Design a protein around this ligand. Structure first.
Ligand SMILES: [Zn+2]
Ligand SMILES: [Zn+2]
Ligand SMILES: [Zn+2]
Ligand SMILES: [Zn+2]
Ligand SMILES: [Zn+2]
Ligand SMILES: [Zn+2]
Lengths: 29, 29, 29
């Protein structure tokens, strides 16, 4: 459970970065 | 602290999910 | 490590709040 939490937190971080990038490129183009 | 943090991770995950759904909507108008 | 996990969760939540505020500005002008 400790390590499953840690991996969820890593995926959240990666997902959020992917959002941040979509968010940016919708802002542009 | 454990289930508090788990609850806090669950809330972020669904807020992020909302964000990704609203970004995709914005994408299509 | 617990305190490191919590700081990472705090930072994720700040970036999410920031992505949410940017998304509202894009939705609504
Ligand atoms: Zn659990
Ligand atoms: Zn639990
Ligand atoms: Zn799409
Ligand atoms: Zn789509
Ligand atoms: Zn909105
Ligand atoms: Zn509007």
């Amino acid at each position: 459970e400790w390590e499953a939490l840690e991996k969820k937190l890593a995926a959240l971080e990666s997902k959020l970065q992917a959002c941040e990038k979509k968010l940016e490129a919708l802002e542009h183009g």
